[PDB]
Ligand binder design. Structure first.
Ligand code: BCL
Ligand code: BCL
Ligand code: BCL
Ligand code: BCL
Ligand code: BCL
Ligand code: BCL
Ligand code: BCL
Ligand code: BCL
Ligand code: BCL
Ligand SMILES: [N+]
Ligand code: NA
Ligand code: NA
Ligand code: NA
Lengths: 358, 358, 358
């Protein structure tokens, strides 16, 4: 049979905390859609508060992949802080490698989230808003040491293209940037990527010569794009009073996919009003984008979810309904929950709400 | 099992009439894709000829919905008339409500449909044309009393945005306008929405102050967009010699969908040439847009269609073929018809033609 | 049951040849998605080297279709040659017919393929690259005798549109050009079509008057578009030391689809490095575009592939693995291969690699 086997667990903190431990595991005997297989990847993301800096988070991520035998890596360390509810700043550094090749980088930037035409008439009438339309402006200064011949060559290639290419450069860069199926995924999610505008390009010297570029773009969304709709929520700095982490890994080939995720992080629950809390609303881009790959083989669901509430708390509402309960432990499987799992794995965004209370 | 149960019925008028009674009912035990559930909605649309006005139709629609407990309404009454085969005019008024908030509006406008590069070489050779490419130009004057503080606030927000925003305003408005999954659906159907151009914005006074805007946009299609391809057909004013109506309602949540539609209206059949008539060609946007939600759960079809021809008329051709017949009554179920139902519910546009004759 | 029955065979040439014989057959009892049925079509494509012209290929194609009873044809004969690895030239002529109407044409043009930002850092590290982003510039001079009244009329319609329409003409032409579902398919594949620019329009005289237009456009891809990513590979002129041909035909209606393809052509295998060869990487646009129709009915796979290697060669790697082997003959069916067939018929691009060696 083609059967998708999966297991998910959430363990929630109580009191004023929004933290939870999250676990997910899945195995399915279908090919992945990658046109190079096997393809394997591990990612780790960490965040900790910085001791001597009020509201600043040290965020790091490490990616390792193997694609048709070729080993790749990316490492990034970044300090991130809000300036206002709309404006966030970042400064960081990192490196990447592909086979025998590597390069490093450093950057700083500002991102301004701008909702379109928000109103109190909406706010006071919609208890759990989902789609929030907006545009999010990036301003980036980046630096790369030109410390091998390929880097020199690519710098020169870009300088000629920018010099010669007027508006075309920043227009046509989008199908370079969003390689492969990434480009189609933009519109799928009601997202838009603006042209790039290059403000300046300079070689400094570092050490050695460094290619320095100041550039800008914006992206927009009609409300599915969670990076815009949930801009403040997705950076839960006030809850980060200790280190948070998540890691995920998958292995895939032309006969199967297997994946594991483990994390401990703020923002797993959220205040729902009225003395209630919910599991955070499911982000929509993961569902819509995974929907672009989840429809290629028929499958049966073999899936269980366990949610462990904080001590003494109880479920107030869940739909699909839990299958069973004992004290803080609630379990879902089969029936309507299994049809919901099938639905979201194929791209559906139907709501599975879980509300609970002290 | 996941089974979709549905039943459809058509009862046709004869002679020179294109009218039919239409009924549809469906129930399916799958979640809807709305990210807020339950979501319920009723719509009623009515059209009647105006006694003292040659070719003018009074068109009304009333929508009531509940989305995550929040009650919404829209009411619109409009007088619509053709000026030429390409140009139609409208004047109307209405109101909307969301929870505790409401506002009213009035408007007038003109819409010009423009096919691209039509030719007699096509006309005389294609017996049943489907894809007709074109662009459809809207010119709108609308008025809203600014009779609560939220309306004042939003007026001021837009005035600043238009003043300050040059071309960006009318560009970026599109992802505000086509909220949520609406934006992606545009391209899915081979449709295009132009930027908005604002011709003027003025507060009048009403009564009290009224926000008045004159603005324009066009939309285009490659031939799937029925609002363009079938522009004259979709407003069957000459057949409307008595009131027409249709109503539909659905209830949905994370475990099921149920829907009912009932109507009596012109345009259910159409002259096919040669002394023949057909059930009107299936519009394609409903199929393509519903295709964006119909692929998220496997289902079995349990579906019957009944078509009742006018007295003495008989089917000349149907594919998929009817299952059974008795006098004017033809029934479809099972076999090829059921595979067609599955197909169109998932987004397929394959032709199911029904031709009949006196 | 809904069952897709299909059979594929590849017979490879050895030595320095990349040629293979290809056969495919399929039958499936589902409706096609065409909104006019039945629809049938045959295509034949032929290529031969020109005796007195070094590197020039005479390429011909003939299409015959019937769509809702209407017979159509297209015939084109073209001489094609590379000037450089990036620039190709063409000169040709042909005719088309629809029912009682026909017209002829002649043309010449140049096409320049331009990859974006290629690098040796990529080249030396990726053994089998797939996604190659780029833009491909067409420059076309075409001539049509205005030798019937419809041609005169359409010429005049276009002259007025171009004269009057500024940038809109070359913008809005895209939804005329990519009729029906073609328009949506562009973005689906990460493809872009630029506006048209018209350089000139003139009536010559021919004979009689001839409408002559010089015009340009580019298309681009993020790497899925094989016409860009595999620009040199897709025109295997150096291997064409004798005539090549392929033919395909299908019949479809609201109850089934049947198709047959037969060809003998260069480029079926390719050097994989290291003394190895592979079956050419599967082109991605056919899979992505067919994916737009392959998801509308559940189906079971009944499918066999046979690959016959050149004498003495053996498979070095295949995933999904072959089912059985005897001497040069390898067969796939069932199991993982059948899940791969289902996957690619629905739009999946997962890699099925076949490597072999002398
Ligand atoms: C029908 C028009 C839409 C709308 C569509 C747009 C569009 C389109 C844009 C803005 C943009 C903006 N809108 Mg608005 N906006 C609406 C209603 C509002 C209301 C309100 C009380 O409802 C407010 C507070 C705002 C406020 C704002 C600003 C944050 C921003 C820039 C204005 C500017 O540059 O001036 C100096 N809008 C209504 C509902 N809004 C602009 C922007 O840059 O957004 C990121 C912009 O181009
Ligand atoms: C620069 C990146 C941005 C950022 C962008 C986003 C975006 C965008 C989203 C979030 C989302 C979340 N973020 Mg944030 N986030 C940042 C910083 C943080 C910090 C911090 C204090 O620094 C914290 C603690 C969080 C915490 C959170 C949670 C509130 C939420 C995920 C909930 C969950 O259960 O996930 C459980 C996790 C899983 C089930 C799967 C995890 C899979 C792997 C291990 C990680 C994701 C990989 C992703 C699919 C692919 C990345 C591709 C890149 C090319 C590398 N983010 C910075 C500022 N964050 C999501 C959300 O729901 O927001 C409302 C979301 O959509
Ligand atoms: C294909 C399956 C679906 C999916 C199916 C489900 C199901 C089913 C359930 C949840 C549930 C939850 N999911 Mg979800 N979910 C997906 C993706 C995400 C992402 C994300 C950033 O991608 C986020 C933040 C969330 C967040 C959430 C919470 C709202 C909630 C509780 C956590 C949980 O049980 O996780 C479980 C963990 C997973 C499902 C693992 C998902 C991992 C995804 C696919 C990303 C892997 C990235 C990979 C390792 C690295 C990529 C690197 C790049 C290639 C460079 N999901 C994918 C796309 N999710 C539960 C819920 O609603 O509780 C109320 C629930 O029952
Ligand atoms: C190869 C070019 C295409 C074509 C593509 C376009 C495009 C593109 C546009 C027009 C537009 C128009 N076309 Mg045309 N058009 C074609 C053939 C025709 C023929 C014909 C006898 O075949 C006629 C009657 C028309 C007539 C018309 C007008 C209704 C309209 C505006 C012209 C204008 O502004 O002048 C003053 N076209 C051919 C087949 N047509 C324009 C318009 O506004 O359309 C809505 C426009 O921009
Ligand atoms: C301002 C709106 C436009 C208009 C736009 C359209 C569009 C667009 C289409 C039609 C279509 C039709 N219209 Mg018209 N139509 C108008 C005025 C009229 C008047 C009239 C004399 O005033 C009449 C009698 C009709 C009659 C008809 C039929 C010829 C045809 C539907 C056939 C059928 O069997 O439906 C049976 C109905 C059903 C199976 C389902 C009905 C569902 C519910 C009850 C109504 C539709 C809701 C829709 C899905 C969502 C609307 C969302 C909005 C945000 C509110 N229209 C005005 C001028 N009409 C369709 C067609 O096929 O044209 C060729 C079509 O695509
Ligand atoms: C998901 C199912 C498919 C669908 C499946 C079928 C099937 C199967 C058959 C038809 C048939 C017909 N359909 Mg259809 N059809 C759909 C949508 C439409 C729409 C439309 C405006 O949406 C129109 C005008 C038509 C028109 C037609 C006629 C050509 C024909 C005879 C009427 C009939 O039997 O209706 C039956 C009525 C329905 C199927 C109900 C459809 C209601 C749709 C989904 C809209 C509901 C709107 C909701 C109530 C309100 C939305 C409000 C907004 C959220 C604000 N269909 C949807 C998208 N249709 C029959 C035929 O071809 O006869 C020859 C036939 O056998
Ligand atoms: C971050 C920028 C991207 C990039 C994105 C673009 C974009 C965007 C465009 C070019 C275009 C071109 N690029 Mg580049 N290009 C990159 C790196 C390179 C490198 C290299 C050694 O890596 C080289 C050899 C090239 C070379 C070239 C030329 C073939 C071409 C035109 C330049 C011109 O008009 O000048 C006179 N690029 C980097 C990786 N390239 C231009 C073009 O016309 O492409 C078809 C163009 O607009
Ligand atoms: C003007 C057209 C272009 C061109 C554009 C393309 C494009 C684009 C592609 C190819 C591809 C291929 N081309 Mg080339 N090709 C041209 C000239 C040639 C000549 C020659 C010496 O003149 C030769 C021998 C080839 C040979 C080849 C093969 C290397 C490869 C197909 C492999 C296979 O097994 O197919 C076996 C075939 C089948 C399984 C199915 C065949 C179906 C039918 C009979 C033909 C295709 C119809 C297509 C779906 C629809 C066309 C619609 C039009 C509106 C008419 N091409 C010219 C220069 N060629 C493909 C590839 O993989 O490249 C890497 C590809 O994507
Ligand atoms: C829906 C089914 C899928 C598909 C499923 C498979 C499967 C399954 C297998 C291959 C395999 C192969 N396919 Mg494939 N393949 C498709 C389309 C293509 C096209 C193309 C130009 O459309 C090309 C060049 C190829 C090329 C290739 C080679 C890489 C490989 C060996 C040839 C073979 O066995 O062909 C077999 C022939 C076919 C599948 C026939 C495909 C015909 C397509 C649908 C086009 C028909 C055009 C029609 C006749 C005319 C249209 C005219 C217009 C309407 C005007 N495929 C379609 C879209 N292909 C085999 C492989 O990977 O070996 C290692 C293998 O096992
Ligand atoms: N899609
Ligand atoms: Na390096
Ligand atoms: Na009010
Ligand atoms: Na002719």
């Amino acid at each position: 049979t083609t059967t998708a086997h999966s297991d998910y667990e959430i363990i929630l903190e109580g009191g004023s905390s929004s933290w939870g431990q999250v676990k997910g595991r899945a195995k399915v005997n279908v090919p992945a859609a990658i046109p190079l297989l096997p393809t394997d990847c591990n990612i780790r993301i960490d965040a900790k508060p910085l001791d001597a800096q009020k509201g600043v988070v040290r965020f790091t991520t490490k990616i390792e992949s193997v694609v048709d035998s070729v080993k790749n890596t990316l490492n990034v360390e970044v300090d991130i802080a809000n300036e206002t509810k709309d404006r966030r700043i970042a400064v960081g550094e990192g490196s990447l490698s592909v086979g025998d090749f590597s390069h490093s980088f450093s950057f700083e930037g500002s991102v301004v989230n701008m909702y379109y035409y928000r109103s109190d008439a909406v706010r006071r009438n919609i208890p759990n808003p989902i789609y929030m339309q907006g545009r999010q402006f990036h301003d980036i200064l980046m630096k790369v040491p030109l410390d091998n011949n390929d880097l020199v060559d690519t710098w020169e290639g870009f300088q000629q293209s920018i010099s010669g290419g007027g508006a075309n450069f920043g227009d046509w860069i989008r199908e370079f940037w969003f390689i492969g199926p990434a480009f189609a995924a933009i519109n799928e999610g009601g997202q838009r990527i603006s042209p790039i505008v290059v403000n300046s390009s300079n070689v400094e010297g570092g050490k050695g010569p460094v290619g320095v570029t100041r550039w800008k773009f914006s992206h927009a969304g009609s409300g599915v794009v969670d990076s815009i709709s949930r801009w403040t929520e997705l950076f839960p700095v006030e809850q980060l009073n200790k280190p948070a982490s998540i890691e995920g890994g998958f292995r895939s080939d032309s006969q199967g996919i297997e994946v594991k995720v483990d994390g401990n992080l703020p923002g797993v629950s959220r205040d729902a009003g009225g003395g209630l809390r919910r599991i955070l609303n499911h982000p929509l881009i993961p569902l819509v984008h995974h929907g672009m790959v989840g429809k290629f083989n028929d499958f049966t669901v073999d899936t269980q979810l366990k949610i462990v509430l904080p001590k003494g708390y109880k479920i107030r509402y869940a739909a699909p309904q839990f299958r069973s309960q004992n004290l803080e432990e609630y379990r879902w499987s089969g029936g309507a929950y299994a049809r919901w799992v099938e639905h979201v794995c194929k791209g559906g965004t139907g709501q599975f709400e879980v509300l609970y209370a002290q």
